[PDB]
């Protein structure tokens, strides 16, 4: 479920070959992590937005379906708005990581 999302991250981290900056987190406190995912999930769509691509929409969509349902809240967490702003590269990768944490849980 969480493992499916990794594979999808690659397709895109590809299909992309630019863009701008997304809100990313790696200071990922286990205890603040479902919030981190939500932020990631939103941001993710910023790619569909910029990309006219059909295939990547279908991909982020597949990913959201997985993620959304997996999740289905916490305290003291950082808002999305107050996250680091990284590249389409670091975001993706930083996504990959936060999925892993979910995995080991």
């Amino acid at each position, epitope marked *: 479920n969480w493992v499916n999302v990794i594979s999808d991250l690659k397709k895109i981290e590809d299909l992309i070959q630019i863009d701008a900056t997304l809100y990313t987190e790696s200071d990922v406190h286990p205890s603040c992590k479902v919030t981190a995912m939500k932020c990631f999930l939103l941001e993710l769509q*910023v790619i569909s937005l910029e990309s006219g691509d059909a295939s990547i929409h279908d991909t982020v*969509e597949n990913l959201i379906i997985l993620a*959304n349902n997996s999740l289905s809240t916490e305290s003291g967490c950082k808002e*999305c708005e107050e996250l680091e702003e990284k590249n389409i590269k670091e975001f993706l990768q930083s996504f990959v990581h936060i999925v892993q944490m979910f995995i080991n849980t």
Partner: antibody
Amino acid sequence: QVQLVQSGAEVKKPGASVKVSCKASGYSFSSFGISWVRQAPGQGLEWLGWISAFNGYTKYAQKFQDRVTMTTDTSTSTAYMELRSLRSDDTAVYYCARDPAAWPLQQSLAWFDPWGQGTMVTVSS
Amino acid sequence: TQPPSASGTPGQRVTISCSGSTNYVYWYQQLPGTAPKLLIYRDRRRPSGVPDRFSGSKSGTSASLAISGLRSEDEADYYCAWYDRELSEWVFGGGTKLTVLQ
């Protein structure tokens, strides 16, 4: 191709209710959300609120929170807007728009794309 | 807060101001008898299918919609939006009717 297709023009009396619908096509209605905005004739846009087509969680605008009820039907890929105790000044075209937020926290970073044709609502006694 | 009225000649570069007191600002174009459509998001960004001509900027305590290369097709109402983090609500500029002259 993505579409939102809403219901037809309505005519209502004060104190009455309207239920506007908003049918979604071309995507996973349920992975996302719907935002409702309205426009009094010859006037501006005002956001009514929002709903996650995923969890049914909602967020109402203060101005409407007392009379709106937004819902969705995963099965018919339809969001609904219900405004009650209709008053005169509720006369307005009501729109729906896809909204990337399935979760309330995300909703602050939202954009509305695309939009339904809209649904004229006239409140006349 | 935006001017209710804006004028422009074809090929002209025009500007629409959305001011106030400071975060992110969005732009929507409502062609005459249609529903609004997303023009600009997160201040600067253009969703796919939104012409170069269209660009947004934020400066001081006020963002604006720079629309160049002007055409008649561009004749519409432009609404800026933002999210009142204090009210936890979305709010809209009052709008700016834009007339392309002929």
